[PDB]
Amino acid sequence: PDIIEKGIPITEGIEPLKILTTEAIKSKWKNEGLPADPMSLENAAIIT
Amino acid sequence: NILAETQNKVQGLQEELKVKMVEVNKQREETDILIEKVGKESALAEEE
Amino acid sequence: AELNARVNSLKRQLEEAEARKMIVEQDAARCQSRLSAAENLVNGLAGE
Amino acid sequence: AKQDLVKKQNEYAVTLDKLESDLLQSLSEADPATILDNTELIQNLDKT
């Protein structure tokens, strides 16, 4: 919300999942015992 | 910047090619009509 | 004999005029095929 | 279907990226007299 007010030119609808890591690399992690819950993908995007 | 240059060369080689093709068609169409007129005249002279 | 010679000369001129037409027609058909191939390349490079 | 689509979305992106580079080298290398009736350039524009 505070970024929309400041008018910093954010891409409309971005969330940390999509903006940090791609869709190909999420599908790689599905194969290495990362469950599809937001919290584990989020955590996994962070360690990277 | 490469496309724009090649496209401009092509378009010109397109336009000059089309202009020649149109001129040749018109010249063809004229020489047909004259050949047909001479063909009628020749048939009349053949009958005489 | 004069009329027969005139008829033969006219018939030759027509066969020549017909042959020249067929060459102008085939040259026109090639020049139209180039014009279309150029229009394909305009649509090609313009689209890109 | 989603996982087959994601591999195809990734696959097609690489083939288009390859075709993109094969337009830049092909146009620049070929001469303006060859470009008009060149077979490889007509094929790439159809595929792209």
Cβ B9 vs Cβ D35: under 8 Å? yes
**What does the CA dihedral A7, A12, A16, A18 come to, rounded to 10 degrees?**
-140
Write the residue in C34, C38, C44 that is nearest to D45 by C-beta. Answer: C44
Q: Tell me how close the Cα of D7 comes to any Cα of chain B, in angstroms.
A: 31
Physical contact, B and C (3 or more Cβ pairs within 8 A)? yes
Query: Is D35 in contact with B9 (Cβ distance < 8 A)?
Result: yes
For this entry, resolution in Å reads 4.0
Cβ C24 vs Cβ B21: under 8 Å? no
Instruction: Please list the alpha-helical segments (H only) found in chain C.
Output: 2-47
Q: Tell me how close the Cα of B24 comes to any Cα of chain D, in angstroms.
A: 21
Cβ C41 vs Cβ D45: under 8 Å? yes
Integer-rounded Cα Rg, in Å, for chain C is 21
Touching C: which chains, 3+ CB pairs < 8 A? B, D
Q: What is d(CA B39, CA C10) in angstroms, rounded to the nearest whole number?
A: 8
Experimental method: cryo-EM
